[PDB]
RNA sequence: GGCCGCUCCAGAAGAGGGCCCCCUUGCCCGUUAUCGGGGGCUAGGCUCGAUGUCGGCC
């Protein structure tokens, strides 16, 4: 409970640029340790980026990271840093410090005993955008044993995230709101839908809520069945 | 020359109570260097089993690791609520480090059909100059299926994207989008869209279209 | 046929190097760092050694 680490720098950033993150820690000393950044890609594994021993300075790197990236330690802040350098697309992932115990009785680094909460890096060329709001709207033709299905579909937005609710909060049950799609515009898109009783339709309001902070804008949507 | 480790299965359910087994396979021989993680979604990994058996202190004894040759395992003895993760072997016998990608622990449930809604482009987006058609499938376990589109009897390849929810906290099942994004132009030179869905709850695939303009 | 050698030729010639496997690091060891022992291979391609089918002397 004492050992704790703390990355920070994590953020949005174009294709050549740079970001320095940090992983600061407590609880242990860090020349007695190994420290560590692996990444994971959104909706991937854990990719292995860095390492490096306070104690005596040594570092290694994975191949598609070298001379672009440079791990670091100030022991005096007790604080380990990874500097990268022509960031691209592919870089990004949530970034998360490790920590790996020295013990001089052993003889070999063993495993990463110890993670950070993870800090968010994002490479991309596209524009703050606000996402355009579109009805999925329910028809006459497709209730199923007494379901509509309607929606909103949240389209061309960057970056993430946007939170979507409906009816303000006051509609819960039976919403889907899915995961965001990276489309090749480099543009995210997302659909939330909410199944309601099909005779509700005429005399309920079901409108979807758009959040997305990083453009300050809020979206109110009315869905509504198309007729004939 | 790296060594690699290979997960299997991608994913699997299981019940509280269920014995659990979760595979690894190094690409070559890693003695006996390989640790397991657990990563619940939206936080870090941690560690449980180091030098193949050896278990990490605070790890509950139901956890346990084991090795045949180059095949690593790790074993749940009695599944636990808080057991649903995705769960990751590593080598560490020789530099760079490496990672299998990971297997999902999932929830097993009764088998549940989807309820398909396929919804036309909105006019509102016509007007912008594309065209996205999406069908849903609600609720359905197990997340195997296969959503086929159609366009005036032809079907689409490379013009669709799909999206998955995780298994809902309530009922344990899976929603799915596929959004068939064509433009103004394309979307106008055809009149029947088609979204076809099998899945083991269905005793043969549903169709769910519409005629564009009615 | 002797002696001295490897400058040249030969591969007839064995170590280095390189790959794989077992032993939960297992005589002793171990760079804040994965060893050691055993096993299975790789030869004339580089280094060193050795040799003569080679060179020099008599
Ligand atoms: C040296 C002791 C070792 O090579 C001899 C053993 C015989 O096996 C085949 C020769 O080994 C090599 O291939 C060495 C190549 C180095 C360039």
């Known amino acids: 409970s004492e050992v704790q680490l703390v990355e920070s720098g994590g953020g949005l950033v174009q294709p050549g640029g740079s970001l320095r993150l940090s992983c600061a820690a407590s609880g242990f000393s860090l020349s007695s340790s190994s420290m560590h950044w692996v990444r994971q890609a959104p909706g991937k594994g854990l990719e292995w980026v860095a390492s490096i021993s306070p104690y005596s300075g040594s570092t290694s790197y994975a191949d598609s990271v070298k001379g672009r990236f440079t791990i670091s330690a100030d022991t005096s802040k007790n604080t380990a840093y990874l500097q990268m350098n022509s960031l691209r697309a592919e870089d990004t992932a949530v970034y998360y410090c490790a920590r790996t115990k020295y013990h001089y009785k052993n003889y070999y680094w063993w495993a990463l005993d110890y993670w950070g909460q993870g800090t968010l890096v994002t490479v991309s060329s596209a524009s703050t955008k606000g996402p355009s709001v579109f009805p999925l709207a329910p028809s006459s033709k497709s209730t199923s044993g007494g379901t509509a299905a309607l929606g909103c579909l949240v389209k061309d937005y960057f970056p993430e995230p946007v939170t979507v609710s409906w009816n303000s909060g006051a509609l819960t049950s039976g919403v889907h709101t899915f995961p965001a799609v990276l489309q090749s515009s480099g543009l995210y898109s997302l659909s939330s839908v909410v199944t309601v009783p099909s005779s509700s339709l005429g005399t309920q309001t079901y409108i979807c809520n758009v959040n997305h902070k990083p453009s300050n804008t809020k979206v109110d949507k009315k869905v509504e069945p198309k007729s004939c | 020359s790296d060594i690699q480790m290979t997960q299997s299965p991608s994913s699997l359910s299981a019940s509280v109570g269920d014995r659990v087994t979760i595979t690894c396979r190094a690409s070559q021989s890693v003695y006996y260097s390989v640790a397991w993680y657990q990563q619940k979604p939206g936080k870090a990994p941690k560690l449980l089993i180091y030098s193949a058996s050896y278990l990490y202190s605070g790890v509950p004894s139901r956890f346990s690791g084991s090795r045949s040759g180059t095949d690593f395992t790790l074993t749940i003895s009695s599944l636990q609520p808080e057991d649903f993760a995705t769960y990751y072997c590593?080598?560490?016998?020789?530099?760079?480090?490496?990672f299998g990608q990971g297997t999902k622990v999932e929830i097993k449930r009764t088998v549940a059909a989807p309820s398909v809604f396929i919804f036309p482009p909105s006019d509102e987006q016509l007007k912008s100059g594309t065209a996205s058609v999406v069908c849903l499938l609600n609720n359905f376990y197990p997340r195997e299926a296969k959503v086929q589109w159609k366009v005036d009897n032809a079907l689409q390849s490379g013009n669709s994207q799909e999206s998955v929810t995780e298994q809902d906290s309530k009922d344990s099942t899976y929603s799915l989008s596929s959004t068939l994004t064509l433009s103004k132009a394309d979307y106008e030179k055809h009149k029947v869209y088609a979204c076809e869905v099998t899945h083991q709850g269905l005793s043969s695939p549903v169709t769910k279209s519409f005629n564009r303009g009615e």
């Open positions: 590593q080598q560490y016998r020789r530099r760079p480090i490496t």
